[PDB]
């Protein structure tokens, strides 16, 4: 929910975004999306990626949001795809709002952050 796609209340184009992705009940504020926001700023699709190939990436971070680690937690079976996104994660290296949380909440959520890289609008 960033850049030009917030929600259904978003007059971007003809986008019937009635059923959006996961919401925040307990926690995971505007933060996961930030992480994600960041990751794509840093991320880079490969010629190998398909319109729904995906990587679970387990990150590790400091109470600053500074990414201390990041690996492929669950591979798409495409190391470029998987890793390009690792290099998406690692390149951000520090996320903003992690310092706005309870250390306990950060530990819960963003201590290790899991980013699922699952494309949109490929060539194929």
């Amino acid at each position: 929910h960033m850049r030009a796609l917030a929600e259904l209340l978003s007059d971007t184009t003809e986008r019937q975004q009635a059923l959006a992705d996961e919401v925040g009940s307990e926690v995971t504020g505007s933060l996961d999306d930030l992480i994600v926001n960041l990751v794509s700023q840093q991320w880079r699709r490969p010629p190998s990626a398909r319109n729904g190939m995906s990587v679970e990436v387990l990150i590790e971070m400091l109470p600053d949001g500074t990414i201390t680690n990041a690996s492929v937690s669950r591979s798409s079976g495409d190391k470029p795809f998987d890793s390009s996104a690792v290099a998406a994660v690692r390149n951000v290296g520090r996320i903003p709002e992690m310092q706005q949380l309870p250390r306990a909440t950060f530990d819960s959520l963003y201590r290790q952050r899991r980013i699922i890289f699952k494309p949109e609008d490929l060539s194929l």
């Binding site: 992705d21 996961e22 990751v39 794509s40 899991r114 699922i116």
Partner: peptide
């Protein structure tokens, strides 16, 4: 936290 679906990356086409 719940793994968030990042579909975006470089501002490619």
């Amino acid at each position: 936290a719940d793994p968030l679906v990042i579909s975006s990356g470089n501002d490619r086409a």
